[PDB]
Design a binder for this molecule. Structure first.
Ligand code: ADP
Ligand code: K
Ligand code: K
Lengths: 338, 20
């Protein structure tokens, strides 16, 4: 309806940026680095303050040598190329990007509410209305991303930030990829991998819908549907694919989850003839006003405490390390396009 | 309970991505 024209225009905007990416829009000495907000397997994100504007941002710093060592060059180029090109209410904005002799930098809006992860572990679990509010935003976000032929591949509470209005901001496009049809990389987070990833047969955007299943379950249960102490045991459970539900889950929720956590691709919601509408029109989401969610007019069920720009109280503390920059350029050719 | 078994497990903290 107005979704089609919306998405069509969205694609035009995205493609222009995808075709001619922004580069080199800031420099290191334009910011004062304050505190580490979070880390991933080979990245660190710091709260910084931009000198000339006074604004705070979140600076993701990647050591080029580590990226190379881990064979993540192409992924890293994907991450930045895609992030600089997208535009959606629940995707974090990339404000600047640049590189120096040693590191790559992606400077994003600072989302001060913290990871969904920390709130979820602390509180224990989210009620179904609360989980539903967040899930709706992810459904819309994947509808947008997929329409651009993008697959996100890293949905998890750790990569979802809560903004000052209580809405979600998706972060970490490390595994995002523009692909028409099928791909094969074993990547993601173990608990969230679709079986077809694990079984190495090639996969498509449907893996995102599976992961949404895992996210909804975890939000509403307080623990993932497939957990164990080591990744290998997790994969065994996923591939078995037997799911059990908490006693408090509604019938509607369970029915939705059986259709998302569905090994059979001919049967998995999101992957059928009716596409995302099989999800939007499911009884679990009957109370959801899809347009109002997009417009951010729904009252958030939780609104984290804010305490003044630069407040980091919604984030765990991390050990700090010096940001080295060598007088010798590292991996210059590899990252030419960054 | 499932909750107890989760909470006693080694994977209750922030989870790292994998990328092989
Ligand atoms: N825009 C941001 N605002 C506030 N915190 C951020 C932002 N982006 C990332 N973070 C914090 O940094 C952590 C790591 O960011 P992430 O992009 O997931 O790096 P990685 O690829 O190394 O896992 C996130 O889990 C979150 O705690
Ligand atoms: K991450
Ligand atoms: K990442």
């Amino acid at each position: 309806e107005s979704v089609k024209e919306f998405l069509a225009k969205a694609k035009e905007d995205f493609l222009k940026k995808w075709e001619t990416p922004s580069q080199n829009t800031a420099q290191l000495d334009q910011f004062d680095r304050i505190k580490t907000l979070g880390t991933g397997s080979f990245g660190r994100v710091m709260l910084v303050k931009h000198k000339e504007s006074g604004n705070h941002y979140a600076m993701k710093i990647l050591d080029k040598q580590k990226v190379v060592k881990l064979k993540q060059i192409e992924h890293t180029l994907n991450e930045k190329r895609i992030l600089q090109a997208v535009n959606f209410p629940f995707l974090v904005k990339l404000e600047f990007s640049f590189k120096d002799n040693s590191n790559l930098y992606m400077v994003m809006e600072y989302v001060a509410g913290g990871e969904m992860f920390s709130h979820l572990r602390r509180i224990g679990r989210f009620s179904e209305p609360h989980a539903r509010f967040y899930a709706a935003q992810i459904v819309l976000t994947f509808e947008y991303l997929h329409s651009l032929d993008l697959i996100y591949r890293d949905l998890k509470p750790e990569n979802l930030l809560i903004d000052q209005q209580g809405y979600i901001q998706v972060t970490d496009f490390g595994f995002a990829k523009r692909v028409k049809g099928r791909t094969w990389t074993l990547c993601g987070t173990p608990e969230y991998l679709a079986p077809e990833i694990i079984l190495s047969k090639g996969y498509n955007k449907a893996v995102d819908w599976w992961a949404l299943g895992v996210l909804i379950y975890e939000m509403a249960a307080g623990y993932p549907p497939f957990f164990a102490d080591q990744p290998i045991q997790i994969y065994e459970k996923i591939v078995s694919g037997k799911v059990r539900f908490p006693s408090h889950f509604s019938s509607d929720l369970k029915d939705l989850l059986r259709n998302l956590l569905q090994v059979d691709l001919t049967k998995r919601f999101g992957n059928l003839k009716n596409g995302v509408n099989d999800i939007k029109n499911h009884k679990w989401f009957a109370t959801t006003d899809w347009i109002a969610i997009y417009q951010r007019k729904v009252e958030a069920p939780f609104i984290p405490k804010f305490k003044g720009p630069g407040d980091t109280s919604n984030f765990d503390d991390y050990e700090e390390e010096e940001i080295r920059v060598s007088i010798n350029e590292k991996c210059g050719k590899e990252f030419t396009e960054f | 309970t499932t909750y107890a078994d989760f909470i006693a497990s080694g994977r209750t903290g922030r989870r790292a991505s994998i990328h092989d």
